[PDB]
Amino acid sequence: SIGPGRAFGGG
Amino acid sequence: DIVLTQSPASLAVSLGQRATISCKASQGVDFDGASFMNWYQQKPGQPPKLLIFAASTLESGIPARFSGRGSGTDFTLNIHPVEEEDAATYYCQQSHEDPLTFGAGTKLELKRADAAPTVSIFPPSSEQLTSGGASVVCFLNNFYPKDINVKWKIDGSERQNGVLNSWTDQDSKDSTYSMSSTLTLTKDEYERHNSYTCEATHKTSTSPIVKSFNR
Amino acid sequence: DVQLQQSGPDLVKPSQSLSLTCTVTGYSITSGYSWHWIRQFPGNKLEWMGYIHYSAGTNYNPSLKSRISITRDTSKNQFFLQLNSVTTEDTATYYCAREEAMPYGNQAYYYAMDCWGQGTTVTVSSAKTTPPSVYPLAPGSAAQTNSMVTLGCLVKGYFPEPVTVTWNSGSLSSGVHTFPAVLQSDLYTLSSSVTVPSSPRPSETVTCNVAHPASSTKVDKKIVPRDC
Secondary structure, eight states, X not given: OXXXXXXXXXX | OOOEEEEOSEEEEETTSOEEEEEXXXXXXXXXXXXXXXXXXXXXXXXXEEEEETTTEEOTTOOTTEEEEEETTEEEEEESSOOGGGOSEEEEEEOSBSSOEEOOOEEEEEEOOOBOOEEEEEOOOHHHHHTTEEEEEEEEEXXXXXXXXXXXXXXXXXXXXXXXXXXXXXXXXXXXXXXXXXXXXXXXHHTTOOEEEEEEEETTOSSOEEEEEXX | OOXXXXXXXXXXXXXXXXXXXXXXXXXXXXXXXXXXXXXXXXXXXXXXXXXXXXXXXXXXOTTTTTSEEEEEETTTTEEEEEXXXXXXXXXXXXXXXXXXXXXXXXXXXXXXXXXXXOOEEEEEOSSOOBOOEEEEEOOSSOSOSOSEEEEEEEEEEEBSSOOEEEEGGGTBOTTEXXXXXXXXXXXXXEXXXXXXXXXXXXXXXXXXXXXXXXXXXXXXXEOOOOOO
């Protein structure tokens, strides 16, 4: 659960 | 870019009172029912410390007198009851998108009873004199509020040429302020006068506080 | 436990590159989500610079654009920062922080920069490094009063910042005021005050310890009584 604008996610 | 606007830039609160700082994003920072707004606190000479993340969740080791609420574009941090160790700058930071942006911050200055300064004057060291210079310094310590006016007088006349004043942040102990004023003259200029007066003007006295010495 | 630490030059001449290192202890750089570089300009204004994802991929702030480069070294457990074509407006305190999964709510997660380093000051200027001159500040009066007595140290003519001044090696912690340095002609001047009971000095000895790492200067001045 990372922000929509973040270039990289977590899973 | 998401611009976080914090209000106010600074506020004064007495211990026991309630302090409330606001932070506004130029765009909504919600997503999947979670506000990507965090709060950091930074005391002078230290790195920013995390307090709250996701708008309202407190970090481990952070006392419950700290609360945070909001959603969308408007968020606020609340401190109650304001303790002595809360004097610091608080910044809000959004993790909604890259680039991550911060707020300008809000200085939390603690309010207390008025206190007059303890003025001390110092002639130049003989060690500095041999090097052809002369710095006569005057310390004005532990006073409240930070509003103070410092004036120098050589033989009665004002002197602003060569003066450098410096201010310390609020003390996390007694909540006071201090200030040093240094008059730097050449060895010769110094020896061309007698009376050296460091005169202060603070809200705690009708007349000016003064410390002096003669050669 | 976990600890981040910056290292690199105090002074860099304009148009040169700036290389900083963030050494991570008690945690592996491959174990975290992201590793950031953030800087604070005099005035306390923060600016996020960029980060390197655990997958080695990166993202940088558009303002820095093409001047920034972040890399790493898994074997030494360090991530770097390189900034090309620096100017005076690049003078600031750099911090490297870790972004990690904060378990919050009913068994869920949220990423936050939770552990920061102490920060390292970097000054971009042509100006040459200069050692400070320490001067003792003994009361000009014949100690005639009682109560407390204030002594101080004048540290002047040094570049760049910072300067570490302490009293009696650290014994004297209370009643100590270190006034922020104030620049004047490429040279800084700072002063520290100490208010102590009339009992100790001059019976006991008071000493101010000034340390200017950039010049590798370490000086001790014993505040001794004034006269002739």
